[PDB]
């Protein structure tokens, strides 16, 4: 048998893993990928219904991206953007991002990860408000169950307890308002629109209690990804933005998951009617073939930063890999493919098929909710549909269900007791059918396990 | 070319004055080969910084490029979350642990050095909570140290340029003195006594803050971006004794020093550091891919592991953590460094570099020549007795770096010092050319100043 599992146990500390259990069980070693599939070291194939980490838009064997990497490696395999240095793929990618943006944007700043990007945005907003002579205007508002990454600062923006417990987070000045999840937080008989009203009132009261002059920015994923595929209620973003504009608070759209065709349009900001001052992009940006993220800032944000960078000598910020030529070349080619192959439209089509397939299970006794938009969805299981209570404890069903899905050849992700769907954009109709079938088998297993 | 206008229109550059950039536009680098890069006008430059202290194998290593291809065609993306794994992360982690200069237990991967140090902060907090020491959370670092630029890692960083305007450092991130004898020793003080004073400073800081509140001390073995600052003799010995006395972790930031930069495989070896945690990046992959790695020792792992069990899972990880292409490239890169004996070769080339620069040791504008292995700096001054700058601090360094570029060499000014950090594969003739181009830039600067005397 392969030496790899023992070596993995001996030498790797895994993210998002119980380290002690890992020492007992060892890894599931993924050996290779092609199309929407990955294969373990025993040769078993799985539909990667998460596209890896919400990210492999073009699947696991796109030869154009691979050749784009090769072409750039053979030209200039590393360079940087520090001190006026530049290079073609960062320039052409920045051009393309600005010109495809759903609202007018001024500049792009590159990082490696979504976490670094949001961390950078925090720093940029502080820097901006200092430049503007508003030293108190520094607080960020985000939402319960939001996920913005896991640096010290971005984990503070994040609203999931799993990212904060044990880590002494959030830092001060990172405030949280309600998760816009109607199923869990609406009143009995309350409409989506009235639920949205109540959330907007909550935001305004929070701004008032803190002192509006101390609030710099509001950040949100158009729909929440890692926190549960939570679609906000109708009118939420309209009403929330009105509150933000009233108090001169920046609106930051975290498009790390929603970006590049996930939600039925190119950006989640389009789908949900968001006019952000700043956008954060990653993941599908490069089909995760290279680590890269991008921040788009509008004109007022750029102008204030630019002014301060002059007064303070240079902008004292940047990663070694910021705009890495291979990562930018791969992302550029990736965006071209998404456009040329009409994958936004195709994904929207496939998403309707996914959602209608799943909706066959709406009356199942363990299905509490089916939600989603475009080609992202979740099914939330419960132990009792009237009370919405979990079986045993929150997470017990989702853990079992995700494990059963894997046994039936599908990789999903449990988010508490919901299981997620975020397949590659290139998924076809029968493959959507198979995703639903493998969900159904896992659901059948879970039902028998829970028992009468 | 349409590129310069497009760059000015669309890119906010790191470590650049944005207004000046709108006036001047970029220097567009088009291609690279060996130790050279070429701009879009065809002019060639020796990349005496190896890009960003990082391109160990130069700019056209075909083995790294083919290693990337082979992995892209196997599995171009996967992750390490929830027990998932893959061969290149496993084999890289094995190699890193087995090559470590002290016994290490586990590797955690990130994309950047900044993310890695940020992660270390979180790991240390998480550890001390697991151990039932909730107060033991403060970090101590040094003036002019550079640890990256996330909110937390910029707090560790001790360069004002990284903090002014950004409301940093955060509370709980404390700084002690820059160990640079030339600038901070008392008149007539020995290196060893300077080291004694720095150790006393650290101990007094630990005492004033409450030792029970201090979790960790972090330092680059020699400081890179902050000036190629070699610590005085006996510094690391004495500093570590203080840390051990109070049960404070010792974290070696090897982002620049790692993989043969300093004359041995690690800066920790060169300077006699026994770190609890090491942070690696840059030469790890010759920067062909964004990757960094954290090595943690047994006690650090065991505490983290215990808490990750009690709390369900370790709530930390980047999408790109252990990225299969980045890890495959890094693994091949380390194999090349070993197979081609590049640690030894770089040590040899570094002696040539230093002896070449030392022909200018009595020049009226040369204040100090420092370094070790294949990293060095020449610090220029306007007056050697007072060590004062010519005009404003930074004038000489800026002028020198601009002249070096005109003579076909990319160097980095750090105030009035110019840095050297060439690819490890640099050969003897190429070291000769680096020093020649330094000399021409120095001649130009000297003529520009007119020292007289």
PDB file of C-alpha atoms in Angstrom, chain B residues 250-451:
ATOM      1  CA  UNK B 250      11.129  31.608  19.610  1.00  0.00           C
ATOM      2  CA  UNK B 251       9.919  32.070  16.056  1.00  0.00           C
ATOM      3  CA  UNK B 252      12.464  32.263  13.229  1.00  0.00           C
ATOM      4  CA  UNK B 253      11.204  34.200  10.221  1.00  0.00           C
ATOM      5  CA  UNK B 254      13.176  32.570   7.408  1.00  0.00           C
ATOM      6  CA  UNK B 255      11.152  34.091   4.555  1.00  0.00           C
ATOM      7  CA  UNK B 256      14.344  35.618   3.090  1.00  0.00           C
ATOM      8  CA  UNK B 257      17.077  33.564   4.886  1.00  0.00           C
ATOM      9  CA  UNK B 258      15.619  30.163   4.004  1.00  0.00           C
ATOM     10  CA  UNK B 259      17.218  27.779   1.501  1.00  0.00           C
ATOM     11  CA  UNK B 260      20.845  28.801   1.250  1.00  0.00           C
ATOM     12  CA  UNK B 261      20.770  32.597   1.339  1.00  0.00           C
ATOM     13  CA  UNK B 262      23.059  33.027   4.366  1.00  0.00           C
ATOM     14  CA  UNK B 263      25.812  30.445   3.857  1.00  0.00           C
ATOM     15  CA  UNK B 264      23.954  27.472   5.305  1.00  0.00           C
ATOM     16  CA  UNK B 265      20.549  26.005   4.480  1.00  0.00           C
ATOM     17  CA  UNK B 266      18.831  28.161   7.107  1.00  0.00           C
ATOM     18  CA  UNK B 267      19.541  31.426   8.866  1.00  0.00           C
ATOM     19  CA  UNK B 268      18.810  29.529  12.074  1.00  0.00           C
ATOM     20  CA  UNK B 269      21.915  27.403  11.395  1.00  0.00           C
ATOM     21  CA  UNK B 270      24.107  30.383  10.511  1.00  0.00           C
ATOM     22  CA  UNK B 271      23.091  32.257  13.693  1.00  0.00           C
ATOM     23  CA  UNK B 272      22.628  29.363  16.184  1.00  0.00           C
ATOM     24  CA  UNK B 273      18.868  29.693  16.605  1.00  0.00           C
ATOM     25  CA  UNK B 274      16.778  26.804  17.976  1.00  0.00           C
ATOM     26  CA  UNK B 275      13.289  27.988  17.000  1.00  0.00           C
ATOM     27  CA  UNK B 276       9.995  26.500  18.124  1.00  0.00           C
ATOM     28  CA  UNK B 277       8.405  27.633  14.828  1.00  0.00           C
ATOM     29  CA  UNK B 278       9.901  28.502  11.440  1.00  0.00           C
ATOM     30  CA  UNK B 279       8.297  30.492   8.621  1.00  0.00           C
ATOM     31  CA  UNK B 280       9.468  29.838   5.056  1.00  0.00           C
ATOM     32  CA  UNK B 281       8.609  31.277   1.633  1.00  0.00           C
ATOM     33  CA  UNK B 282      10.289  32.952  -1.407  1.00  0.00           C
ATOM     34  CA  UNK B 283      13.241  30.638  -2.219  1.00  0.00           C
ATOM     35  CA  UNK B 284      10.986  27.764  -1.224  1.00  0.00           C
ATOM     36  CA  UNK B 285       9.644  27.823  -4.790  1.00  0.00           C
ATOM     37  CA  UNK B 286      12.081  30.345  -6.331  1.00  0.00           C
ATOM     38  CA  UNK B 287       8.845  32.406  -6.256  1.00  0.00           C
ATOM     39  CA  UNK B 288       7.694  30.471  -9.371  1.00  0.00           C
ATOM     40  CA  UNK B 289       4.519  29.841  -7.354  1.00  0.00           C
ATOM     41  CA  UNK B 290       3.052  31.657  -4.346  1.00  0.00           C
ATOM     42  CA  UNK B 291       3.650  29.362  -1.406  1.00  0.00           C
ATOM     43  CA  UNK B 292       4.781  29.653   2.174  1.00  0.00           C
ATOM     44  CA  UNK B 293       5.205  27.033   4.884  1.00  0.00           C
ATOM     45  CA  UNK B 294       5.110  27.018   8.663  1.00  0.00           C
ATOM     46  CA  UNK B 295       7.058  24.381  10.590  1.00  0.00           C
ATOM     47  CA  UNK B 296       5.869  23.800  14.137  1.00  0.00           C
ATOM     48  CA  UNK B 297       7.615  21.725  16.789  1.00  0.00           C
ATOM     49  CA  UNK B 298       6.024  18.949  18.868  1.00  0.00           C
ATOM     50  CA  UNK B 299       4.690  20.986  21.825  1.00  0.00           C
ATOM     51  CA  UNK B 300       3.102  23.526  19.496  1.00  0.00           C
ATOM     52  CA  UNK B 301       1.412  20.778  17.465  1.00  0.00           C
ATOM     53  CA  UNK B 302       0.219  18.724  20.403  1.00  0.00           C
ATOM     54  CA  UNK B 303      -1.574  21.682  22.053  1.00  0.00           C
ATOM     55  CA  UNK B 304      -3.205  22.770  18.803  1.00  0.00           C
ATOM     56  CA  UNK B 305      -4.212  19.188  18.037  1.00  0.00           C
ATOM     57  CA  UNK B 306      -5.866  18.762  21.427  1.00  0.00           C
ATOM     58  CA  UNK B 307      -7.970  21.875  21.083  1.00  0.00           C
ATOM     59  CA  UNK B 308      -8.947  21.091  17.462  1.00  0.00           C
ATOM     60  CA  UNK B 309     -10.474  17.886  18.844  1.00  0.00           C
ATOM     61  CA  UNK B 310     -12.396  19.603  21.669  1.00  0.00           C
ATOM     62  CA  UNK B 311     -13.674  22.270  19.216  1.00  0.00           C
ATOM     63  CA  UNK B 312     -14.610  19.894  16.402  1.00  0.00           C
ATOM     64  CA  UNK B 313     -11.985  20.939  13.818  1.00  0.00           C
ATOM     65  CA  UNK B 314      -9.183  23.514  13.395  1.00  0.00           C
ATOM     66  CA  UNK B 315     -11.078  26.595  12.123  1.00  0.00           C
ATOM     67  CA  UNK B 316      -8.304  27.876   9.859  1.00  0.00           C
ATOM     68  CA  UNK B 317      -7.104  27.425   6.287  1.00  0.00           C
ATOM     69  CA  UNK B 318      -6.730  29.151   2.927  1.00  0.00           C
ATOM     70  CA  UNK B 319      -8.208  27.895  -0.313  1.00  0.00           C
ATOM     71  CA  UNK B 320      -4.633  27.727  -1.683  1.00  0.00           C
ATOM     72  CA  UNK B 321      -3.125  26.057   1.410  1.00  0.00           C
ATOM     73  CA  UNK B 322      -0.857  23.377  -0.006  1.00  0.00           C
ATOM     74  CA  UNK B 323      -1.983  24.082  -3.601  1.00  0.00           C
ATOM     75  CA  UNK B 324      -0.802  21.040  -5.608  1.00  0.00           C
ATOM     76  CA  UNK B 325       0.981  23.044  -8.338  1.00  0.00           C
ATOM     77  CA  UNK B 326       2.677  25.364  -5.829  1.00  0.00           C
ATOM     78  CA  UNK B 327       3.769  22.414  -3.650  1.00  0.00           C
ATOM     79  CA  UNK B 328       4.952  20.363  -6.669  1.00  0.00           C
ATOM     80  CA  UNK B 329       7.078  23.284  -7.853  1.00  0.00           C
ATOM     81  CA  UNK B 330       8.485  23.914  -4.380  1.00  0.00           C
ATOM     82  CA  UNK B 331       9.344  20.198  -3.992  1.00  0.00           C
ATOM     83  CA  UNK B 332      11.265  20.144  -7.316  1.00  0.00           C
ATOM     84  CA  UNK B 333      12.971  23.422  -6.336  1.00  0.00           C
ATOM     85  CA  UNK B 334      14.313  21.974  -3.071  1.00  0.00           C
ATOM     86  CA  UNK B 335      15.511  18.872  -4.926  1.00  0.00           C
ATOM     87  CA  UNK B 336      17.503  21.071  -7.339  1.00  0.00           C
ATOM     88  CA  UNK B 337      19.030  23.107  -4.500  1.00  0.00           C
ATOM     89  CA  UNK B 338      20.222  19.839  -2.925  1.00  0.00           C
ATOM     90  CA  UNK B 339      21.325  18.027  -6.107  1.00  0.00           C
ATOM     91  CA  UNK B 340      23.252  21.009  -7.471  1.00  0.00           C
ATOM     92  CA  UNK B 341      24.891  21.835  -4.064  1.00  0.00           C
ATOM     93  CA  UNK B 342      23.623  25.406  -4.265  1.00  0.00           C
ATOM     94  CA  UNK B 343      24.018  26.140  -0.533  1.00  0.00           C
ATOM     95  CA  UNK B 344      27.794  25.612  -0.856  1.00  0.00           C
ATOM     96  CA  UNK B 345      27.932  27.362  -4.210  1.00  0.00           C
ATOM     97  CA  UNK B 346      26.096  30.383  -2.841  1.00  0.00           C
ATOM     98  CA  UNK B 347      28.475  30.563   0.119  1.00  0.00           C
ATOM     99  CA  UNK B 348      31.417  30.610  -2.341  1.00  0.00           C
ATOM    100  CA  UNK B 349      29.751  33.271  -4.492  1.00  0.00           C
ATOM    101  CA  UNK B 350      29.017  35.342  -1.398  1.00  0.00           C
ATOM    102  CA  UNK B 351      32.670  35.542  -0.422  1.00  0.00           C
ATOM    103  CA  UNK B 352      33.430  36.780  -3.930  1.00  0.00           C
ATOM    104  CA  UNK B 353      30.656  39.352  -3.644  1.00  0.00           C
ATOM    105  CA  UNK B 354      31.832  40.650  -0.304  1.00  0.00           C
ATOM    106  CA  UNK B 355      35.497  40.813  -1.273  1.00  0.00           C
ATOM    107  CA  UNK B 356      34.522  42.665  -4.495  1.00  0.00           C
ATOM    108  CA  UNK B 357      32.542  45.241  -2.574  1.00  0.00           C
ATOM    109  CA  UNK B 358      35.339  45.613   0.043  1.00  0.00           C
ATOM    110  CA  UNK B 359      37.632  47.288  -2.505  1.00  0.00           C
ATOM    111  CA  UNK B 360      35.464  50.310  -1.748  1.00  0.00           C
ATOM    112  CA  UNK B 361      35.688  50.110   2.060  1.00  0.00           C
ATOM    113  CA  UNK B 362      37.728  53.354   2.407  1.00  0.00           C
ATOM    114  CA  UNK B 363      35.577  55.296  -0.076  1.00  0.00           C
ATOM    115  CA  UNK B 364      34.357  58.584   1.482  1.00  0.00           C
ATOM    116  CA  UNK B 365      30.672  57.728   0.874  1.00  0.00           C
ATOM    117  CA  UNK B 366      30.790  54.091   2.031  1.00  0.00           C
ATOM    118  CA  UNK B 367      29.679  53.876   5.675  1.00  0.00           C
ATOM    119  CA  UNK B 368      29.341  50.104   6.057  1.00  0.00           C
ATOM    120  CA  UNK B 369      29.513  46.939   4.007  1.00  0.00           C
ATOM    121  CA  UNK B 370      27.542  44.171   5.635  1.00  0.00           C
ATOM    122  CA  UNK B 371      26.064  40.782   4.970  1.00  0.00           C
ATOM    123  CA  UNK B 372      26.771  37.135   4.988  1.00  0.00           C
ATOM    124  CA  UNK B 373      26.514  34.290   2.603  1.00  0.00           C
ATOM    125  CA  UNK B 374      24.916  35.628  -0.568  1.00  0.00           C
ATOM    126  CA  UNK B 375      23.082  38.574   0.995  1.00  0.00           C
ATOM    127  CA  UNK B 376      24.768  41.943   1.401  1.00  0.00           C
ATOM    128  CA  UNK B 377      24.281  45.682   1.602  1.00  0.00           C
ATOM    129  CA  UNK B 378      26.427  48.748   1.151  1.00  0.00           C
ATOM    130  CA  UNK B 379      25.288  51.638   3.252  1.00  0.00           C
ATOM    131  CA  UNK B 380      26.287  55.017   1.882  1.00  0.00           C
ATOM    132  CA  UNK B 381      26.699  58.117   3.973  1.00  0.00           C
ATOM    133  CA  UNK B 382      27.651  61.717   3.360  1.00  0.00           C
ATOM    134  CA  UNK B 383      30.147  61.768   6.225  1.00  0.00           C
ATOM    135  CA  UNK B 384      31.852  58.724   7.695  1.00  0.00           C
ATOM    136  CA  UNK B 385      32.670  60.091  11.176  1.00  0.00           C
ATOM    137  CA  UNK B 386      29.128  61.308  11.931  1.00  0.00           C
ATOM    138  CA  UNK B 387      27.443  58.699   9.690  1.00  0.00           C
ATOM    139  CA  UNK B 388      25.152  61.495   8.512  1.00  0.00           C
ATOM    140  CA  UNK B 389      23.361  61.302   5.123  1.00  0.00           C
ATOM    141  CA  UNK B 390      24.087  63.497   2.115  1.00  0.00           C
ATOM    142  CA  UNK B 391      21.086  65.815   2.050  1.00  0.00           C
ATOM    143  CA  UNK B 392      18.040  63.912   3.299  1.00  0.00           C
ATOM    144  CA  UNK B 393      18.318  60.306   4.484  1.00  0.00           C
ATOM    145  CA  UNK B 394      17.583  58.170   1.399  1.00  0.00           C
ATOM    146  CA  UNK B 395      19.124  60.555  -1.171  1.00  0.00           C
ATOM    147  CA  UNK B 396      22.256  58.502  -1.777  1.00  0.00           C
ATOM    148  CA  UNK B 397      20.432  55.175  -1.865  1.00  0.00           C
ATOM    149  CA  UNK B 398      17.850  56.432  -4.351  1.00  0.00           C
ATOM    150  CA  UNK B 399      20.511  57.960  -6.624  1.00  0.00           C
ATOM    151  CA  UNK B 400      22.665  54.815  -6.437  1.00  0.00           C
ATOM    152  CA  UNK B 401      19.794  52.444  -7.258  1.00  0.00           C
ATOM    153  CA  UNK B 402      18.811  54.603 -10.266  1.00  0.00           C
ATOM    154  CA  UNK B 403      22.381  54.563 -11.566  1.00  0.00           C
ATOM    155  CA  UNK B 404      22.666  50.810 -11.030  1.00  0.00           C
ATOM    156  CA  UNK B 405      19.528  50.405 -13.187  1.00  0.00           C
ATOM    157  CA  UNK B 406      21.042  52.590 -15.936  1.00  0.00           C
ATOM    158  CA  UNK B 407      24.116  50.295 -15.807  1.00  0.00           C
ATOM    159  CA  UNK B 408      21.963  47.189 -16.177  1.00  0.00           C
ATOM    160  CA  UNK B 409      21.465  46.084 -12.616  1.00  0.00           C
ATOM    161  CA  UNK B 410      18.372  45.990 -10.411  1.00  0.00           C
ATOM    162  CA  UNK B 411      19.139  46.653  -6.734  1.00  0.00           C
ATOM    163  CA  UNK B 412      16.816  47.927  -3.967  1.00  0.00           C
ATOM    164  CA  UNK B 413      17.491  51.002  -1.857  1.00  0.00           C
ATOM    165  CA  UNK B 414      16.718  50.630   1.862  1.00  0.00           C
ATOM    166  CA  UNK B 415      17.166  54.238   3.011  1.00  0.00           C
ATOM    167  CA  UNK B 416      20.802  54.835   1.993  1.00  0.00           C
ATOM    168  CA  UNK B 417      21.789  51.178   1.713  1.00  0.00           C
ATOM    169  CA  UNK B 418      21.679  49.222  -1.544  1.00  0.00           C
ATOM    170  CA  UNK B 419      20.963  45.540  -1.281  1.00  0.00           C
ATOM    171  CA  UNK B 420      22.318  42.459  -3.028  1.00  0.00           C
ATOM    172  CA  UNK B 421      20.458  39.190  -3.057  1.00  0.00           C
ATOM    173  CA  UNK B 422      21.236  37.524  -6.389  1.00  0.00           C
ATOM    174  CA  UNK B 423      19.970  34.156  -7.606  1.00  0.00           C
ATOM    175  CA  UNK B 424      21.868  31.284  -5.970  1.00  0.00           C
ATOM    176  CA  UNK B 425      22.900  30.092  -9.453  1.00  0.00           C
ATOM    177  CA  UNK B 426      24.939  33.247 -10.063  1.00  0.00           C
ATOM    178  CA  UNK B 427      28.419  32.339 -11.322  1.00  0.00           C
ATOM    179  CA  UNK B 428      31.828  33.895 -10.611  1.00  0.00           C
ATOM    180  CA  UNK B 429      31.892  36.085 -13.746  1.00  0.00           C
ATOM    181  CA  UNK B 430      28.354  37.257 -12.967  1.00  0.00           C
ATOM    182  CA  UNK B 431      29.346  38.239  -9.403  1.00  0.00           C
ATOM    183  CA  UNK B 432      32.169  40.204 -11.072  1.00  0.00           C
ATOM    184  CA  UNK B 433      29.580  42.003 -13.225  1.00  0.00           C
ATOM    185  CA  UNK B 434      27.363  42.798 -10.224  1.00  0.00           C
ATOM    186  CA  UNK B 435      30.316  44.409  -8.465  1.00  0.00           C
ATOM    187  CA  UNK B 436      31.374  46.250 -11.669  1.00  0.00           C
ATOM    188  CA  UNK B 437      27.895  47.687 -12.037  1.00  0.00           C
ATOM    189  CA  UNK B 438      27.862  48.672  -8.383  1.00  0.00           C
ATOM    190  CA  UNK B 439      31.254  50.404  -8.933  1.00  0.00           C
ATOM    191  CA  UNK B 440      29.978  52.367 -11.939  1.00  0.00           C
ATOM    192  CA  UNK B 441      26.885  53.414 -10.029  1.00  0.00           C
ATOM    193  CA  UNK B 442      29.142  54.417  -7.115  1.00  0.00           C
ATOM    194  CA  UNK B 443      31.439  56.410  -9.453  1.00  0.00           C
ATOM    195  CA  UNK B 444      28.362  58.223 -10.857  1.00  0.00           C
ATOM    196  CA  UNK B 445      27.051  58.956  -7.358  1.00  0.00           C
ATOM    197  CA  UNK B 446      30.433  60.174  -6.215  1.00  0.00           C
ATOM    198  CA  UNK B 447      30.695  62.560  -9.203  1.00  0.00           C
ATOM    199  CA  UNK B 448      27.145  63.760  -8.526  1.00  0.00           C
ATOM    200  CA  UNK B 449      27.911  64.513  -4.844  1.00  0.00           C
ATOM    201  CA  UNK B 450      31.494  65.851  -5.187  1.00  0.00           C
ATOM    202  CA  UNK B 451      32.906  64.869  -1.774  1.00  0.00           C
TER     203      UNK B 451
END
